[PDB]
Amino acid sequence: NLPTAQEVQGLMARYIELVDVGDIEAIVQMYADDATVENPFGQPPIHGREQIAAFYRQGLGGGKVRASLTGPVRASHNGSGAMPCRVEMVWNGQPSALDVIDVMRFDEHGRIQTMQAYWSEVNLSVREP
Amino acid sequence: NLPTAQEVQGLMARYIELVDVGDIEAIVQMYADDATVENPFGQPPIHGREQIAAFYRQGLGGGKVRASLTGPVRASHNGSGAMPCRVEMVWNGQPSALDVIDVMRFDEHGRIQTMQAYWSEVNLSVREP
Numbered sequence: 610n611l612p613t614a615q616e617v618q619g620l621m622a623r624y625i626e627l628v629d630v631g632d633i634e635a636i637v638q639m640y641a642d643d644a645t646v647e648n649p650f651g652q653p654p655i656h657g658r659e660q661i662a663a664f665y666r667q668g669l670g671g672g673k674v675r676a677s678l679t680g681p682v683r684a685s686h687n688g689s690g691a692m693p694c695r696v697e698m699v700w701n702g703q704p705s706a707l708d709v710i711d712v713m714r715f716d717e718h719g720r721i722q723t724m725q726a727y728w729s730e731v732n733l734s735v736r737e738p
Numbered sequence: 739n740l741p742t743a744q745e746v747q748g749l750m751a752r753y754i755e756l757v758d759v760g761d762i763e764a765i766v767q768m769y770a771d772d773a774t775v776e777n778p779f780g781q782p783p784i785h786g787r788e789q790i791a792a793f794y795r796q797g798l799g800g801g802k803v804r805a806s807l808t809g810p811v812r813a814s815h816n817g818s819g820a821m822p823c824r825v826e827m828v829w830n831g832q833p834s835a836l837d838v839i840d841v842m843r844f845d846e847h848g849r850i851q852t853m854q855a856y857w858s859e860v861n862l863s864v865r866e867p
């Protein structure tokens with residue numbers, strides 16, 4: 610069925626673990642084949658697993674990116690949820706920390722149907738030498 | 739124009755301060771007149787300043803509620819934002835805390851057009867002596 614509030618907490622938390630180790634295949638596996646991703650939210654969406662794979666491929670590939678949950682996954686009873694997290698990566702040649710909040714909606718199959726990542730430069734922190 | 743990312747950070751943070759002191763009148767003024775609220779997200783929406791004011795009236799009235807930002811407001815460049823916060827209130831006779839994530843979309847006037855609060859009982863913590 611549609612993931613319960615507790616299942617969602619578990620799914621969204623796993624998601625972060627997978628991004629953290631850059632397991633693109635396992636990441637794409639969590640998505641629905643016609644899922645849509647907005648990241649950063651505000652930018653035109655990307656549709657389908659293929660473009661979504663391509664996104665995580667270039668986003669987590671080449672660079673050195675880590676990500677961690679920085680708080681509890683908030684979860685509703687309609688297969689949706691929202692989490693706070695921190696993405697570490699090189700931004701403009703310098704290591705930086707990015708504060709993000711992802712909102713996910715899941716389908717009756719436990720897969721991500723909608724994904725929106727709220728962040729921008731105001732949330733970017735460059736790590737000084 | 740549509741609030742810049744930095745303006746979005748200011749608006750949403752101010753909103754929490756307003757909720758915190760129970761200023762229903764200032765709160766409502768932040769909302770567009772035909773704004774929609776889904777709180778909790780998953781439940782049927784309420785539309786319009788009149789029903790929104792009634793919602794905050796009963797939500798913040800009678801009870802003794804507190805709210806505080808527990809992390810940075812994540813803001814996009816297209817007039818949206820999400821924030822983590824902590825709401826304190828009396829639940830089932832006992833003081834409790836609720837972990838919430840609010841997502842808001844503002845209109846070109848800087849007023850809240852759309853609001854969704856993500857939380858369920860899995861985000862509820864009853865507080866000992």
Ligand SMILES: C[C@]12CCc3c(ccc4cc(O)ccc34)[C@@H]1CCC2=O
Pocket residue numbers: 628648668669672674696698707709711726728
């Ligand atoms: C895309 C990115 C790496 C991965 C990533 C970013 C931002 C938000 C994210 C949200 C996610 O749920 C998963 C990965 C990212 C970074 C912003 C700049 C960049 O290097």
Ligand SMILES: C[C@]12CCc3c(ccc4cc(O)ccc34)[C@@H]1CCC2=O
Pocket residue numbers: 757777797798801803825827836838840855857
């Ligand atoms: C409504 C409420 C008090 C206020 C409140 C709750 C939940 C989410 C909120 C989100 C807000 O942005 C502002 C206020 C609340 C509580 C749920 C139970 C209750 O006591």
